[PDB]
Amino acid sequence: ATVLLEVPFSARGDRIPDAVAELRTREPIRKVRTITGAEAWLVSSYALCTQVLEDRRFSMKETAAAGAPRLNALTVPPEVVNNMGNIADAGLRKAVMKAITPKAPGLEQFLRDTANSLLDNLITEGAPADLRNDFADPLATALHCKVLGIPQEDGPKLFRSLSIAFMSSADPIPAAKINWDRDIEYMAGILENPNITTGLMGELSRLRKDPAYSHVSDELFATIGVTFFGAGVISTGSFLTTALISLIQRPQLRNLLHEKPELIPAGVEELLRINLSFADGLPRLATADIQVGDVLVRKGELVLVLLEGANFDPEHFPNPGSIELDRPNPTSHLAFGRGQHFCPGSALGRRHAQIGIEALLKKMPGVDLAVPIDQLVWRTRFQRRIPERLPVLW
Ligand code: HEM
Ligand SMILES: COc1ccc(C[C@@H]2NC(=O)[C@H](Cc3ccc(O)cc3)NC2=O)cc1
């Protein structure tokens, strides 16, 4: 007697388990047990992942309903599971999205300067260097302080909430509420601070005093700051970190992108496609009975969209494990999701990774792991796959 297949399969973010392909072939939607003990449907083919993400009857807000089968415990107030919907309902979607493009004057130059300064410090200190804690994460944190318009010196404290905020836990996490409430208070003070005039928080501070938004709650304005900092920093930092591993493990690609930096955008798009940063499938709750492949998903059931199931599906991406810069469908991956909840920071995430990689390859053309790959320590029970340290030499 075996137990019901448990998710997630592996916290390792440097390789996809052979099991994913077997599962996609045999049972591209199948029943699994989550860490809470709930049952869920795991969807692992490109076709079925797209179907679920493009059908709004598979709801992200309803995953927060009391009594629902859960992938993991909430780490935010339940209304925040509907964050983007709340933002849209408040009339703020266009302004938020405009503030988080990489297009603001000087933003890309600030990113490049920051990356180069972080790399110069590592070179001065001497190998080995930790590219996660001393490059990718500080680069993400600095970027998001700039995008939000908040002081750079406030970044590290906000960042240190994230090792708990993005936990994937069976039970509620007391520290998550402590940090959430403190970070909300911080963002509320930012909105009241007359010196905060730029970035997302500068724009929200103005809209807050505009008569067209006089009934939007102060809680929502502060929540936008906390959530966009947290989601953005964790997602860009974790993606860049594991992209660097995939690049370092491919010396020929490292050398090609160093020699021909104009290929870095195509390279980053493939690194996005093969990325294992999301540790769990994307959760949705069925709000009706819906046929998905051979399974009639019933109202109230949990569905998990396995991004690497879609992105490594050979029926859509032939030779899926190979980085190929000339694919005919290069952005059609699901690394940024799809449908109603498509990532609003996708352009910023691309530019963060492109600039970080460009700077690394210029400063450290000889970059290589300083430990055997199996020695990386993969964070467990977390919503991203992250090596705790990424030791390199050059
Ligand atoms: C490479 C970096 C990034 C990756 C891989 C990524 C990935 C994703 C994915 C897969 C989703 C869909 C989640 C779902 O459907 O359940 C998503 C949504 C989201 N992302 Fe990103 N993201 C990145 C960068 C960012 C940045 C920079 C921000 C903000 C500054 C951000 C903010 C969000 C938000 C707020 C959502 C919710 C969107 C929605 O509900 O409508 N992300 N992201
Ligand atoms: C890209 O990752 C995600 C993750 C989750 C969601 C769904 C929904 N939307 C959000 O905006 C925030 C994100 C968030 C921010 C801070 C925090 O401490 C925890 C989570 N919470 C949500 O639950 C969307 C994207």
Swiss-Prot record:
One of its GO terms (cellular component) is cytoplasm. Heme binds at residues 284, 341, 343. The record marks 344 as: Important for the position of heme. It catalyses: cyclo(L-tyrosyl-L-tyrosyl) + 2 reduced [2Fe-2S]-[ferredoxin] + O2 + 2 H(+) = mycoclysin + 2 oxidized [2Fe-2S]-[ferredoxin] + 2 H2O. Its cofactor is heme. It comes from the Bacteria. Substrate binds at residues 75, 83-84, 235, 299, 383. Keywords: Cytoplasm, Heme, Iron, Metal-binding, Monooxygenase, Oxidoreductase. GO terms for molecular function: heme binding; iron ion binding; monooxygenase activity; oxidoreductase activity, acting on paired donors, with incorporation or reduction of molecular oxygen. It is found in: Cytoplasm. The record marks 166, 180 as: Participates in a stacking interactions with the tyrosyl of cYY. The keyword Heme applies. Its EC number is 1.14.19.70. Its main location: cytoplasm. The keyword Metal-binding applies. PANTHER family: CYTOCHROME P450 YJIB-RELATED, P450, PUTATIVE (EUROFUNG)-RELATED. Belongs to the cytochrome P450 family. Catalyzes C-C bond formation between the carbons ortho to the phenolic hydroxyl of cyclo(L-tyr-L-tyr) (cYY) producing mycocyclosin. Can also use cyclo(L-Tyr-L-Phe) (cYF), cyclo(L-Tyr-L-Trp) (cYW) and cyclo(L-Tyr-L-3,4-dihydroxyphenylalanine) (cY-DOPA) as substrate. This is Mycocyclosin synthase.
